Design a protein around this ligand. Sequence first.
Ligand SMILES: *[C@H](C(=O)O)[C@@H]1CCCC1=O
Ligand SMILES: *[C@H](C(=O)O)[C@@H]1CCCC1=O
Lengths: 357, 356
Amino acid sequence: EIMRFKKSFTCIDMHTEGEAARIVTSGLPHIPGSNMAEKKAYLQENMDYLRRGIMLEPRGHDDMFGAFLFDPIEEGADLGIVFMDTGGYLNMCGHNSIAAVTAAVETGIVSVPAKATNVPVVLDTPAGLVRGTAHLQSGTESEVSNASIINVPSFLYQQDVVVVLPKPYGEVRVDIAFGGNFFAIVPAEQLGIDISVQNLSRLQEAGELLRTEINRSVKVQHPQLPHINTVDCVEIYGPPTNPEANYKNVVIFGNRQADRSPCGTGTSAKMATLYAKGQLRIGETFVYESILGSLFQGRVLGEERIPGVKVPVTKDAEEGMLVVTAEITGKAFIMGFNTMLFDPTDPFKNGFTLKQY
Amino acid sequence: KKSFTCIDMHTEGEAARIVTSGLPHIPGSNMAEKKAYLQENMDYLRRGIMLEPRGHDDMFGAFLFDPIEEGADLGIVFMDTGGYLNMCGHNSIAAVTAAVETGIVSVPAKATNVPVVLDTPAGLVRGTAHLQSGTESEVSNASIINVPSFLYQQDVVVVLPKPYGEVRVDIAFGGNFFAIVPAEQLGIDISVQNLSRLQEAGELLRTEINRSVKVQHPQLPHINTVDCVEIYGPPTNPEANYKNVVIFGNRQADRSPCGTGTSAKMATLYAKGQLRIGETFVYESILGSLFQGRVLGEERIPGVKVPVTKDAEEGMLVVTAEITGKAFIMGFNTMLFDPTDPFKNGFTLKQYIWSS
Ligand SMILES: *[C@H](C(=O)O)[C@@H]1CCCC1=O
Ligand SMILES: *[C@H](C(=O)O)[C@@H]1CCCC1=O
């Protein structure tokens, strides 16, 4: 029995509008690193089989997502966190950050002061500090109605980038923007495919293509964060189905996996792009719809121009790059408490996938 | 604010989410009625536990109940993402295993084998947990004696659209109905890379089959369609006799060798004199896992026949087949359902692919 639970992990399984967040709360040994990005590096280089065992079949599946919690390192942070999926490790994730804020408060990782209606929860992520706020349900001790995250600085990186793709797509114009991860943002109409669950496979294909061509043709580099230097996601957007939504989108990333949520980092990136182009005013509410009909809300809270520091879109005529502080709001639920087990003789203790390449 | 406890298992990669507590009270005077009740009035329980976000498109599981049938230790109803089912070889092995490892049935002092009898919608499934050398209750592997199995109809030729054309299958029962077909007949080599193609070929073949042949379980009217296609070929593992993948539901492949598929395969071979009683048959999966099997005996059912029963036989030939495999516990889970959670009953993004 003592030997059964050797190398086990404990998780709070959650979801944010259908998208998994497997939040691993214990089981890791000490992981060397002086910051969250280094701990993530250590995991990827030395312990990547853990991610595979926790994320993939049979304990997960090809669209599972999660995170390891750590003690916070940065000043003012409550919780350290490293995100993972079926392909690798993202520097940030909006839906998991929303889930983490929700879990922190619902399970007592962070104390709720008496008679409080909002509880802050600051996450120390590999992308930087993410300031969360849990909004409590009126008349409960610590039930969370929904959660806000103030993202790391977001920005438009390169505008009107043409990408050459095989038929039936061809030339597609995209923007490249940072919202925690680098996205390539492309309207669906430029792919010939409208956004629906029926067309998902065509979309997943279209966005694995587009993303490879991008990382071939276009070098990106976060100007304040050396370690962030590829386009991890493709955000395909179109007209809203929901009347409350400005737009619908699906984000394709990793092993051509599709995000079920409206995507928080993606929403930050979209809003930074709209804002840079004068199509969104500061404080205005922006609503993004998912493929499942769920909504995230967002607003741009502040702008800054960073002197002497430039990205491709920054004009010759301008001093510094424009960045924005974007808030994203959504709702997460606890769906289970799990103790995941790994028998040394389990031939699938490190998981498996039947997905091609 | 509902709450279920589960022992999450897998049998050589194939899920078995065994629900041990928290289910509502479900009527029925036998296990088939209990399953009928579940499917007509409580399908939301299955959907919540099997589908995303708590499960996924290839999740599989079972609800434990008090046994009803005399001699049984556990009542059980199986299910997957497509519906509730009557029998499941891999989940039976997992259930036997969990039953002994978590102390649902007793271990006699100094025993090396523990019987666990399951009361399923398809009848009694007599299982045995084989214990590891000197442990309180660590399970080495488990055997199940399937419900009676048989060849049903033989060398059925099937004209499929190209590139397939002519393919010959046998049809057999192992707790579920199967169409057994050589991979070679389809022109596809069995591998992970070819899974998509094998899943299509399974659908196409299955369709033409149910179109061109009606089938009937001559002891129960209702069980009357071929849902599963067992595609087999040369083994990769030298211990194995053959390799196979079972295609079922909606372009779903079984990750395990498939217990009921294995029983059906053995009934087939036996009827063709290709397998002896007591001989050990080893069947490999697409992931390289093995189940072992042995025909324990045969029987004739006087009066009763099926298309293969030759004129003069008086009764169809059935066999009793035993299947053995290993299941692992991969989690102790407590599944939660907020009444305000819009996905409390889960969702799937998987489409039925259809033309016109
Ligand atoms: C969505 C999000 O940030 O919520 C992103 C797209 C893929 C996973 C993500 O981090
Ligand atoms: C395999 C088995 O009996 O283990 C069956 C084929 C389809 C689903 C099953 O359970």
